[PDB]
Design an enzyme around this catalytic site. Structure first.
Site, PDB file in Angstrom:
ATOM      1  N   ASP A 119       0.812  -1.215   0.000  1.00  0.00           N
ATOM      2  CA  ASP A 119       0.000   0.000   0.000  1.00  0.00           C
ATOM      3  C   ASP A 119       0.851   1.273   0.000  1.00  0.00           C
ATOM      4  O   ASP A 119       0.574   2.194  -0.759  1.00  0.00           O
ATOM      5  CB  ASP A 119      -1.016  -0.019   1.153  1.00  0.00           C
ATOM      6  CG  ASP A 119      -2.339  -0.673   0.754  1.00  0.00           C
ATOM      7  OD1 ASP A 119      -2.425  -1.196  -0.378  1.00  0.00           O
ATOM      8  OD2 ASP A 119      -3.319  -0.630   1.546  1.00  0.00           O
ATOM      9  N   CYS A 155      -1.890   0.461 -13.554  1.00  0.00           N
ATOM     10  CA  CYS A 155      -2.047   0.398 -12.110  1.00  0.00           C
ATOM     11  C   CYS A 155      -3.320   1.214 -11.865  1.00  0.00           C
ATOM     12  O   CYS A 155      -4.284   1.077 -12.624  1.00  0.00           O
ATOM     13  CB  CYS A 155      -0.796   0.856 -11.388  1.00  0.00           C
ATOM     14  SG  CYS A 155       0.028   2.290 -12.098  1.00  0.00           S
ATOM     15  N   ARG A 201       3.762   2.436 -10.738  1.00  0.00           N
ATOM     16  CA  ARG A 201       4.072   1.032 -10.882  1.00  0.00           C
ATOM     17  C   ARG A 201       4.192   0.660 -12.360  1.00  0.00           C
ATOM     18  O   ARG A 201       5.057  -0.079 -12.744  1.00  0.00           O
ATOM     19  CB  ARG A 201       2.992   0.211 -10.143  1.00  0.00           C
ATOM     20  CG  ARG A 201       3.094   0.468  -8.639  1.00  0.00           C
ATOM     21  CD  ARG A 201       2.078  -0.183  -7.733  1.00  0.00           C
ATOM     22  NE  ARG A 201       0.847   0.551  -7.742  1.00  0.00           N
ATOM     23  CZ  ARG A 201      -0.264   0.190  -7.105  1.00  0.00           C
ATOM     24  NH1 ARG A 201      -0.287  -0.927  -6.386  1.00  0.00           N
ATOM     25  NH2 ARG A 201      -1.367   0.955  -7.229  1.00  0.00           N
ATOM     26  N   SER A 202       3.292   1.179 -13.181  1.00  0.00           N
ATOM     27  CA  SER A 202       3.304   0.916 -14.604  1.00  0.00           C
ATOM     28  C   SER A 202       4.643   1.407 -15.197  1.00  0.00           C
ATOM     29  O   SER A 202       5.264   0.722 -16.009  1.00  0.00           O
ATOM     30  CB  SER A 202       2.102   1.578 -15.271  1.00  0.00           C
ATOM     31  OG  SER A 202       0.848   1.014 -14.812  1.00  0.00           O
ATOM     32  N   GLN A 261       6.477   7.787  -9.948  1.00  0.00           N
ATOM     33  CA  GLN A 261       5.799   8.815  -9.150  1.00  0.00           C
ATOM     34  C   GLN A 261       6.563   9.293  -7.921  1.00  0.00           C
ATOM     35  O   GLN A 261       6.313  10.393  -7.464  1.00  0.00           O
ATOM     36  CB  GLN A 261       4.416   8.315  -8.711  1.00  0.00           C
ATOM     37  CG  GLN A 261       3.366   8.417  -9.802  1.00  0.00           C
ATOM     38  CD  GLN A 261       1.940   8.102  -9.328  1.00  0.00           C
ATOM     39  OE1 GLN A 261       1.550   6.923  -9.138  1.00  0.00           O
ATOM     40  NE2 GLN A 261       1.136   9.154  -9.185  1.00  0.00           N
TER      41      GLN A 261
END
Length: 298
Positions: free
Chosen positions: A180, A214, A220-221, A261
């Site tokens: 998370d 994602c 994540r992508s 990110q």
């Protein structure tokens, strides 16, 4: 050389700085189509939009818009479609894109629920006997099989164009254990996952581009595509040295904003590429060690 750079950056505690440097250098292109008011409900996040130049167009006269970008890596000869997690009203569009683009794989890097909020619509069927029909795009989707491992699940899906009644097998690779907050402690399970996608044929040039998402399709992508491409380039010119991960990331950022990110995602990308390099450089035994260390059964 990236491992020396890695240790230098770690020693000097300057990840935040390196990452901001990237944000400042990153391309800025217009997203005028994304921002048209008729498309407001096709976007999950107002700050994450596809550039006009690289966006995927749906092959429909009505509204060709989907929040998805073609990331075309020329040297590596790999393409990826990065997209947001489908919205309740864009699931039909999503599968339309998969059909029209001739993709074989979908890589999902999120859970439907994270941090107690919905990050993505339930866009695929959870049971064989309860297929989904997307009326707006006239497509049928059926769960064929599913193989649940400890850190990811692979699904075989059958996508039918109801108009022509052609069917294709789509493979759904669902990384289920991204935490998370933060990034994974070890890239092992991530690399094992990437290699599973590769093995499947889904990344290969005889198919359309893999669809990677994602929640927003950048974090994540971004990490997944960056790692894959860096490893591929290292393979193609057998030279860890020449491959500059920061430069590859900036190249990718010409095609979709925001890829990677956080600074910790950057650091993690380095780790993955560095660790992944073991396999690429001749140590074939390393992939068996990731499988053991990832702890995939049960």
């Amino acid at each position: 050389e990236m491992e020396k750079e890695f240790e230098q950056i770690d020693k000097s505690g300057s990840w935040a700085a390196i990452y901001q440097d990237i944000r400042h250098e990153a391309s800025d292109f217009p997203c005028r189509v994304a921002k048209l008011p008729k498309n407001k409900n096709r976007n999950r996040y107002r700050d994450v939009s596809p550039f006009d130049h690289s966006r995927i167009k749906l092959h429909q006269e009505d509204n060709d818009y989907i929040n998805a970008s073609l990331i075309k890596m020329e040297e590596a000869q790999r393409s990826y479609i990065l997209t947001q997690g489908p919205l309740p009203n864009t699931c039909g569009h999503f599968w339309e894109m998969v059909w029209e683009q001739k993709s074989r794989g979908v890589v999902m890097l999120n859970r439907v629920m994270e941090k107690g909020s919905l990050k993505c619509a339930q866009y695929w069927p959870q049971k064989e006997e309860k297929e989904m029909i997307f009326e707006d795009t006239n497509l049928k989707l059926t769960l064929i099989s599913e193989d649940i491992k400890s850190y990811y699940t692979v699904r075989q899906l059958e996508l039918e164009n109801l108009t022509t009644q052609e069917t294709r097998e789509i493979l759904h690779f669902h990384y289920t254990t991204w935490p998370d907050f933060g990034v994974p402690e070890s890239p092992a399970s991530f690399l094992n996952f990437l290699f599973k996608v590769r093995e499947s044929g889904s990344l290969s040039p005889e198919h359309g581009p893999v669809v990677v998402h994602c929640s927003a399709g950048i974090g994540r992508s971004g990490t997944f595509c960056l790692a894959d491409t860096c490893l591929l380039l290292m393979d193609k010119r057998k030279d860890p040295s020449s491959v500059d991960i920061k430069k590859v990331l900036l190249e990718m950022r010409k095609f979709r904003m925001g890829l990677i990110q956080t600074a910790d995602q950057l650091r993690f990308s380095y780790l993955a590429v560095i660790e992944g390099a073991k396999f690429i450089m001749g140590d074939s035994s390393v992939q068996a060690q990731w499988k053991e260390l990832s702890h995939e059964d049960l």
